[model samples]
Target: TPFTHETLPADPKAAIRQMKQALRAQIGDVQAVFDRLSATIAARVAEINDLKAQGQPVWPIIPFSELAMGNISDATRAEVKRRGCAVIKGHFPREQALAWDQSMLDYLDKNHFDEVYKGPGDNFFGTLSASRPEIYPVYWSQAQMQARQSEEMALAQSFLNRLWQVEHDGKRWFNPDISIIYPDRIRRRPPGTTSKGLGAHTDSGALERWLLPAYQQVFASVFNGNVEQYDPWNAAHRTDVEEYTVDNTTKCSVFRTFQGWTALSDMLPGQGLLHVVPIPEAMAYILLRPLLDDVPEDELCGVAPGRVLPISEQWHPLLMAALTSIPPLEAGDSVWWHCDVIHSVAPVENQQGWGNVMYIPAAPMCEKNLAYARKVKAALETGASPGDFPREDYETTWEGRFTLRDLNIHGKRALGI
Candidate 1:
């Protein structure tokens, strides 16, 4: 029971500020449009809250404000947290979604952008900001809606709401929200190109996700521990997540968020889309990883198909767990998981083109995130990550993007002066 990790920050608030500065110096700064981008996040969360009030499941699909998110029910909310991923359907039209996919291709053609990895001329993974208002409307149009439309977006967005619900103390305003949408590209594997497949890992926000106790507990139930008595629907531990900190060193050690992806191609079950270990608990597995420094041989054999494992067995936080691999999807299908859920891209090397997706997740206008978003806005105006992601290069020349002014006046307040 002796976990001797470095003593982190004493105060969560100071740690938030210090870590933001430290991470900025370590990573890179966000570009301009911080305030406006954050302001935009509020609407998405509002939609999720609406779904919850209606007692909807939010995955397998729910509905947004003026529209139905999807056809999900209340039964699946527990499952979503369990598998760390949920599917959503029924919004955009398949045809329209396909068309939007084509539009992405056209955009790439016009921009002359190439796929991220080794692929055919038509790559699926891209990095361009699909922020062009014209594009948003198209994706937001009835055509794309026809293919598999808002059902998917609704699912993706609602899953986020549920994830936020299981996290720690906070107002709803700054919770995670989906603001950025992308017209992603795809990849086509060739005959001779080897596809040994993807590896085990989670999304990019390691420091942020596991840095808050209240936030981290959502993942704790199943993270790296045995699941013989596990319950995906269990919401108890989130209340007990410990706040580990030091007196004056100023460091924090926990946070948990959600993760997800959308489908654009018509790949089937084995087409290599996404996958994660079905450990059920989020912070539990993640937290278990750090405490276990020794490797237990017999313990490895004891793991029931999906039962949890102790930290000493093989729960390495630094090393992303070997979780499940999500199967392929239809044109409008979607997959989202809890942040602590260990996942990776599935292996369908021989598929025609790459599976394309825009990295959009829903977050709410909760206190912490909103507060951080405001600081992020300020840092952007001042050139930095406010206190969230690693910093990136400052704005040199961009137009029609969000500005600090676009944020709600309250959102502005969230950001520190």
Candidate 2:
């Protein structure tokens, strides 16, 4: 049965116990793994402090031209890898991004959207839906299509993908250098709008990571406590898993190496912007948190298969303290972070300029993404939203929306057309 609108199991504590037993059978010495992870966490926390003390940025900002043109220094590239997040300046033209936002505004007005009309989500993944038009459900706009298919977007995403070194093997599991379009939503939060809901979280998987067989391989070292062998960048066994048997719009089906967004409006720091815990090995902290003595084995870190893994001061206090916001952003600036990093949208209070962005990501061509691409292609044909999102046809009948013809060669391949 679909657990989309459901809560925990009847015997939550017992369920976790069984889950632990399964882990033990699959991989031995869970306690030892816990100790190693604890040690790693402490060291990582101190490292961040050292960087902060030297007034060095924990989340490095790189010039987009450096990335696209392969002109980056080895030191900066290493910093990007270690921190797991970056701000890519000049990823798109500033005037172009501003124009995209203008086009979005025009698209919404032309469609006569009932901004007050609430849909599938009562909250952001069943949390709390503030009474504001921050999230727009429309997905098939011409501006979105053009942006998703642009060569610059493709080049930038491909550069992000190359950061993950593939392991030596008989065959590669995913194409690390190819960028694919994984359709996602856009957000436009106007000034004076308060966002109190979004807590720190990771989007790759929740309880699904622990429950699925293939994901067991993805974190084999973490499960057995041989965390030294864990590599967050390894594509092996990652593309073969199903995140959830119960599909929901909030569920992310594609594997995003770097979850990113292209800015559409000017956003100054502390005025309701995105923030992240930029530690790459933070995945270790998330994996081991559930195994602590204080936590019951049956409970999976207060998450289930379909939900996003949320971090709390109660669960991950160290990472919470280290959460850092990106510097102020101009239109056309892009931001990206590793998939496992804990990130959130800071709450705004009497904010300044508009904070708008189109959700894009460094989704390389892989088993899972290619499958979704076919679905997205069909959705475009009928003017329907991508399968990963809500089942609303807000754009099927709208004029000036994109068709397959809007796609260039890269766009054609991105959608698997």
What TM-score would each prediction reach against the true structure?
A: 0.50, 0.91
Cα lDDT tens digits, model 1, 1-417, are 111112343443444444334322332322222222223323433544465468654343433322253444556554555445666553345675567666656644443334221212121111111101111111211222222224345345544565544443343323344322221213333332335344444433233333544443434323222223444443333333333322221121122344454555565556555655544344333433322224242122122211122222124432233333444456665566664455555554455654555444443334334433444454434433223221222221222223445443333332333
Candidate 2 clashing pairs? 15-298, 16-297, 16-298, 17-298, 33-225
**What TM-score would candidate 2 get against the native?**
0.91
Candidate 2 minimal-lDDT segment of 10 residues: 1-10
The TM-score of candidate 1 is: 0.50
Residues 337-408, model 2: lDDT tens digits = 998888888788887888888888888897688988888888888987777776677788887787877788
Q: Please state the error at residue 336 of candidate 1 in Å.
A: 0.9
lDDT values for all models: 0.38, 0.75
